């Protein structure tokens, strides 16, 4: 059976805290943006010739414009302010555990925000060869998990150290693995 | 850039189902249960620090319906091309044999946003304690959705996530077992 | 969310200058309106202010200024008229936001020759 | 634009008068306020879309229903010795805004 989708995204883009804000009102139909309002532009602009008659109608109403203009303030900075309290300033620090699959895994889990820095070390030396990461995975519930295998078949008496850094713990977390 | 807050809503015909939600850097702030007319925080604890007027989300959707209708007819009524979902199954933390864990079925990159998802323990449908996210918005305007099954890892248990969709030839299964 | 009109009854001469004053609960970017009502009837919108321009005009040569710093949105006329005697109401667009308006208890105004 | 009536509705006690409000401005949201002298207008009920409606501040003993987008009638139960006051009705649309409020002429109730 045939499907039809109307779709609207209202975007608030924040640079340097809320120094620079930019606002996008985007109208789609079936994966096709036909008209948007860009706070950086001032008026409604048509994206495909399907939305050209719409955006000409909408910029005629000068009341509409003035109003949409100030969403960067009324809408954007406003919502930021409200929620910064528990989104921006949200830090949950990682849960790190090292173990070899049956070659060495470093499993950081349940952390926020995204940006994270994992490094493998061999005997106090930074390994840069065998680093094979699964990259930053989204858990979907305001937590992230990532894994970083190290490609080493080792020798007895060596110490491997996984070194996590994150904006929720100042001095780095470090886990150990003796061969 | 630093932070991106997006208010993504939509109305799909002829199913006549809507959704309204707030996205912060990928994660859901909240959505609005259209039926119960409720604001619903992705985490209970958001309730403390902010509030949303559920009705507002309705009056919006009801415009997107009106839009939908005029937009379909302004395009010979051309239907939406399905994109089928890719599905990935994983455990929210390293797995221990008798530690309680949780299975994530992560449905990614698809449209239109409708799926008939099922969990399968040893082959039999599970319903005990499952939670599911609402439809979440991507940069390319395709959809994401998660699902969650809390389980006790055992050596005699094999779970599967049964995603359906109108882009798939046959129902897809992603099988995780220890 | 909250508005307050300090003058309860302002008297003034025909031809003089008018300034019904009105203050607003702290808000950043609130929407403000001035309404006027002749006894027995409804309110006309005199003028509004969402954002941007600091000073706006209204009907029957009215004016209002938005002093962010001041938390004040006061109504003005340079040359009042006899017609203008009614109750005036100040109202704020409430609070993240409808739709619903909150009114100040309203300052009434009579004018003499 | 909004027509309320009748303008004056004197009524017995323990009687459930219902104040009618119609609008051909094609506005989406619709409001009732009661103006008690010296104080501002106080919000009674308002409906943002057809068939939904939510309490304002002084909502005890009033009820309203929104079957039609054009009609929003306020029923004054003998809830309180509220009643003897002046009732006001307004509407507004959402396209971009959040449109300004538009006012009916209002009606006086008595007892």
């Amino acid at each position: 059976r045939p499907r039809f989708l109307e779709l609207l995204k209202s975007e608030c883009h924040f640079f340097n805290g809320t120094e620079r804000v930019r606002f996008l009102e985007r109208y789609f139909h079936n994966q096709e943006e036909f008209v948007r309002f860009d706070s950086d532009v001032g008026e409604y602009r048509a994206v495909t010739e399907l939305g050209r008659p719409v955006a000409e109608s909408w910029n005629s109403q000068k009341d509409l414009l003035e109003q949409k203009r100030g969403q960067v303030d009324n809408y954007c900075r406003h919502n930021y302010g409200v929620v910064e309290s528990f989104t921006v300033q949200r830090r949950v620090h990682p849960q790190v555990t090292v173990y070899p699959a049956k070659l060495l895994v470093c499993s950081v889990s349940g952390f926020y925000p995204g940006s994270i820095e994992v490094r493998w070390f061999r005997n106090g030396q930074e390994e840069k060869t065998g680093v094979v990461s699964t990259g930053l995975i989204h858990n979907g519930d305001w937590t992230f998990q990532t894994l970083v295998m190290l490609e080493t078949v080792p020798r007895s008496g060596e110490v491997y150290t996984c070194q996590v850094e994150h904006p929720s713990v100042t001095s780095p977390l470090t886990v150990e693995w003796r061969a | 850039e630093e932070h991106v807050i997006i208010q993504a809503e939509f109305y799909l015909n002829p199913d006549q189902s809507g959704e309204f939600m707030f996205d912060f850097d990928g994660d859901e702030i909240f959505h609005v249960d259209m039926a119960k007319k409720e604001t619903v925080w992705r985490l209970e604890e958001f309730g403390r620090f902010a509030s949303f007027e559920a009705q507002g989300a309705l009056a919006n959707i009801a415009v997107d319906k009106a839009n939908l209708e005029i937009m379909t007819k302004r395009s010979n009524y051309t239907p939406i091309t399905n994109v089928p979902p890719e599905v990935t199954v994983l455990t929210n933390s390293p797995v221990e044999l008798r530690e309680p864990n949780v299975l994530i079925c992560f449905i990614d990159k698809f449209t239109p946003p409708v799926v008939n998802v099922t969990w399968l323990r040893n082959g039999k449908p599970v319903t005990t304690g499952v939670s599911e996210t609402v439809f979440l918005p991507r940069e390319d305007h395709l959809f994401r959705k998660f699902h969650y099954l809390p389980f006790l890892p055992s050596t005699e248990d094999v779970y599967d996530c049964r995603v359906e969709h109108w882009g798939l030839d046959e129902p897809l299964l992603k099988h995780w077992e220890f | 969310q909250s508005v307050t009109q300090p003058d309860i009854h302002i008297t003034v001469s025909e031809g003089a200058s008018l300034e019904l004053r009105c203050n607003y609960s702290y808000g950043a970017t609130p929407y403000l309106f001035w309404y006027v009502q002749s006894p027995g009837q409804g309110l006309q919108l005199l003028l509004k202010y969402f954002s941007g321009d600091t000073l706006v005009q209204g009907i029957k040569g009215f004016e209002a200024e938005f002093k962010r710093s001041q938390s004040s949105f006061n109504l003005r006329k340079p040359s009042v008229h006899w017609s203008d005697a009614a109750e005036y109401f100040c109202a704020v667009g409430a609070s993240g936001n409808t739709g619903k308006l909150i009114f100040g208890q309203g300052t009434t105004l009579q004018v003499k020759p | 634009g909004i027509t309320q009536s009748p303008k004056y509705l004197f009524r017995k006690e323990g009687q459930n008068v219902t104040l009618s409000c119609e609008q051909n401005l094609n506005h989406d949201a619709m409001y009732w306020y009661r103006q008690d002298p010296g104080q501002g207008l106080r919000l009674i009920y308002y409906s943002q879309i057809v068939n939904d409606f939510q309490k304002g501040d002084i909502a005890e003993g009033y009820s309203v229903s929104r079957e039609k987008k054009e009609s929003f009638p306020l029923t004054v139960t003998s809830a309180q010795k509220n009643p003897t006051a002046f009732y006001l009705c307004a509407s507004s649309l959402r396209d971009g805004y959040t449109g300004e409020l538009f006012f009916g002429e209002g009606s006086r109730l008595t007892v």
Binding site: Y75 | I29, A57, N60, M71 | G96 | -
Partner: peptide, 13 residues
């Protein structure tokens, strides 16, 4: 305190 919500224009008919 409250999260303000942006309103889509109704498409001209």
């Amino acid at each position: 305190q409250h999260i303000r919500c942006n309103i889509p224009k109704r498409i001209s008919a």
